[PDB]
Amino acid sequence: FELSVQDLNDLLSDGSGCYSLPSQPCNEVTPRIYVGNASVAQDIPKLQKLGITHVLNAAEGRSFMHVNTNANFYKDSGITYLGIKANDTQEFNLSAYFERAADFIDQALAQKNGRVLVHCREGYSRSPTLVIAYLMMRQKMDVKSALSIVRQNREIGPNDGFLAQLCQLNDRLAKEGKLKP
């Protein structure tokens, strides 16, 4: 997958072999789907003002790379929570969660007033991966179009492992039917 991952990295990068970091805490990357960092996830009044009804913590844990929230944190806030304890490493199998995460996103967007925040620590690798996979799975986009639309609305940089996993998902979805360019 190396050179296919290299292609996706070429779509993300700034032309100096480097990658831009997010310019804001949170962005609406496609209608009613927000990707953001830990600071927005931990700010319930801010979530409520934004109209966030569902929060997917893709970095649930306790370390410099995690966000130590849980269902209890959101108890009686009106916000429905799902946590995934993913690590932001090339060897973490985030693809094992693509269906679960896509189902959660679908559950939020099925409600016409629903808005979902998918976040990690920085809103840069784990959380965008899950949104990209959702776009591929539930809107039939190929990986390059899905990655491109998210990156147009937030500086992201899925790690190379996650990119390979998205390439593998693209392959799996392409066995069902054609994917939209």
Swiss-Prot record:
Reaction it catalyzes: O-phospho-L-tyrosyl-[protein] + H2O = L-tyrosyl-[protein] + phosphate; O-phospho-L-seryl-[protein] + H2O = L-seryl-[protein] + phosphate; O-phospho-L-threonyl-[protein] + H2O = L-threonyl-[protein] + phosphate
Compartmental location: Nucleus; Cytoplasm, Cytoskeleton, Flagellum axoneme
Active site (record annotation): 120
InterPro entries in alphabetical order: Atypical_DUSP_subfamA, Dual-sp_phosphatase_cat-dom, Prot-tyrosine_phosphatase-like, Tyr_Pase_AS, Tyr_Pase_dom, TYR_PHOSPHATASE_DUAL_dom
Tyrosine-protein phosphatase domain mapped to chain residues: 24-175
EC class: hydrolase
Predominant localisation class: nucleus
GO BP terms in the entry: cellular response to epidermal growth factor stimulus; dephosphorylation; negative regulation of cell migration; negative regulation of chemotaxis; negative regulation of epidermal growth factor receptor signaling pathway; negative regulation of ERK1 and ERK2 cascade; negative regulation of JNK cascade; negative regulation of MAPK cascade
This enzyme's EC code(s): 3.1.3.16, 3.1.3.48
Hydrolase found in the keyword field: yes
A Pfam family reported for this protein in Swiss-Prot or TrEMBL: DSPc
One Gene Ontology cellular component annotation held by this UniProt entry: cytoskeleton
Xref: SUPFAM superfamilies: (Phosphotyrosine protein) phosphatases II (SSF52799)
One Gene Ontology molecular-function label: protein tyrosine phosphatase activity
Keyword terms: Cell projection, Cilium, Cytoplasm, Cytoskeleton, Flagellum, Hydrolase, Nucleus, Protein phosphatase
Function: Shows activity both for tyrosine-protein phosphate and serine-protein phosphate, but displays a strong preference toward phosphotyrosines. Specifically dephosphorylates and inactivates ERK1 and ERK2.
Quaternary state and interactors: Microtubule inner protein component of sperm flagellar doublet microtubules. Interacts with VRK3; this interaction activates DUSP3 phosphatase activity.
PANTHER family for the chain: AGAP008228-PA, DUAL SPECIFICITY PROTEIN PHOSPHATASE 3
Family under the similarity heading: Belongs to the protein-tyrosine phosphatase family. Non-receptor class dual specificity subfamily.
Protein's UniProt name: Dual specificity protein phosphatase 3
